[PDB]
Enzyme design. Structure first.
Site, mmCIF file in Angstrom:
data_model
loop_
_atom_site.group_PDB
_atom_site.id
_atom_site.type_symbol
_atom_site.label_atom_id
_atom_site.label_comp_id
_atom_site.label_asym_id
_atom_site.label_seq_id
_atom_site.Cartn_x
_atom_site.Cartn_y
_atom_site.Cartn_z
ATOM 1 N N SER A 124 -11.746 1.447 -1.502
ATOM 2 C CA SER A 124 -10.729 1.318 -1.373
ATOM 3 C C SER A 124 -10.205 2.924 -0.431
ATOM 4 O O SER A 124 -11.672 2.882 0.484
ATOM 5 C CB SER A 124 -9.648 1.628 -2.381
ATOM 6 O OG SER A 124 -7.586 1.928 -2.057
ATOM 7 N N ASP A 143 -8.261 -5.315 -1.441
ATOM 8 C CA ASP A 143 -8.861 -3.991 -2.057
ATOM 9 C C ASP A 143 -9.925 -4.493 -3.161
ATOM 10 O O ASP A 143 -9.963 -5.197 -2.757
ATOM 11 C CB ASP A 143 -7.922 -3.024 -2.432
ATOM 12 C CG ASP A 143 -7.906 -1.872 -3.119
ATOM 13 O OD1 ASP A 143 -8.540 -1.556 -3.987
ATOM 14 O OD2 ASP A 143 -6.993 -1.468 -2.833
#
Length: 357
Positions: A53, A191
């Site tokens: 991320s 993600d």
């Protein structure tokens, strides 16, 4: 020391990415001073740079080559990045159906700062994580493992948006590359935290171990000899303060909406604690505990907890948390602070480069 493998890992945490960035600004500055080189960059000292991320965004910005075939961003340019673009990345769309953010700004600034660069051009080995919701499999982006299967040679902005494409926060990303046969290869990515690796430190250690089988520069760790391995893992902070946690009783009637706004924080926290336990267990078994430096904050309070609080007041607080972390002890019994442990680490990095040269 010259045969040792160096690995850097950066956790996800949204806006809490200021904390490892503050930590990296300190470390890169130590190396710049020691080596008398203001152009010294982390990619010059690390073999593998892993990130999930926002940790993956950071990874991409310090690994991507610029016009001089030098890392695109200095470590001191990352907290200004978060301060400049953070309030616009984390600006709510206002739409009722879908995620909190449209991801439009996040993709635009990533495209702007990464250009048309591909993962094969990274100045060091990169490990940027994602989860493919169509193949229902984690998709890990590396510079290596490209010889076999060239369809993973994706754009740095597609990799970077995808690693941060947090369900409920940003929409999933769809993009296409081409296989060796010239036909299209599809990506439907969310993600990297979904791929269970909010803390990519063990994944980064495994990539290096697998590379050691096919690369002579990584040969020292070929048979799990983590004695010849230096690992710097960086967190975005956790919290155990009762103000920010919950009881089983209050959660008994919680609906699917309440859980969704809270599971990512829980799995990401769990990812930090489990990966650290795995790595500590392994490094302590080889009597090389100090080879693994885990810089993590355990007492986040107030607004500092939230991943998308990109207000000036919260960003300034996150810097302060980062700067206090440097003065905090590594262990509960060890009086050695992180600033001191990071100086020892920088020195080792500095000495290994010299010997390899």
């Amino acid at each position: 020391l010259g045969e040792m493998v160096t690995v850097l890992s950066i956790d996800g945490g949204g806006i809490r990415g200021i904390i490892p960035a503050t930590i990296l600004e300190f470390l890169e500055g130590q190396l710049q001073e020691m080596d008398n080189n203001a152009d010294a960059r982390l990619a010059d000292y690390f073999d593998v740079i892993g990130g999930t991320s926002t940790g993956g965004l950071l990874t991409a910005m310090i690994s991507t080559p610029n016009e001089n075939n030098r890392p695109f961003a200095a470590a001191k340019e990352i907290v200004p990045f978060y301060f400049e673009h953070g309030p616009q990345i984390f600006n709510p769309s206002g739409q009722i159906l879908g995620p909190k953010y449209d991801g439009k700004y996040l993709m635009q600034v990533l495209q702007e700062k990464l250009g048309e660069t591909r993962v094969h051009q990274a100045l060091t080995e990169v490990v940027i994580s994602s989860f493919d919701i169509k193949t229902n499999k984690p998709v890990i982006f590396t510079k290596s493992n490209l010889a076999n299967s060239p369809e993973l040679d994706a754009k740095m902005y597609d990799i970077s948006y995808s690693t941060a494409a947090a369900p409920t926060y940003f929409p999933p990303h769809y993009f296409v590359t081409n296989t060796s046969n010239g036909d299209e290869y599809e990506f439907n990515l969310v993600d990297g935290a979904v791929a269970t690796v909010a803390d990519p430190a063990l994944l980064s250690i495994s990539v290096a171990t697998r590379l050691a089988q096919k690369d002579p520069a990584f040969a020292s760790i070929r048979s799990l000899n983590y004695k010849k391995m230096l690992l710097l893992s960086l967190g975005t902070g956790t919290t155990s303060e009762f103000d920010k946690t919950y009881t089983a009783k209050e959660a008994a009637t919680w609906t699917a909406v309440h859980w969704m706004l809270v599971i990512q924080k829980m799995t990401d926290a769990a990812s930090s604690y489990m990966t650290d336990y795995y790595l500590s267990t392994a490094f302590q078994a080889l009597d090389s505990k100090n080879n693994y430096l885990r810089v993590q904050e355990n007492a986040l309070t107030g607004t500092t907890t939230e991943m998308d609080d990109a207000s000036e007041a919260n960003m300034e607080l996150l810097v302060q948390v980062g700067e206090n972390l440097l003065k905090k002890p590594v262990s509960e019994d060890n009086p050695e602070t992180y600033e001191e442990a990071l100086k020892r680490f920088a020195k080792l990095l500095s000495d290994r480069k010299k010997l390899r040269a």
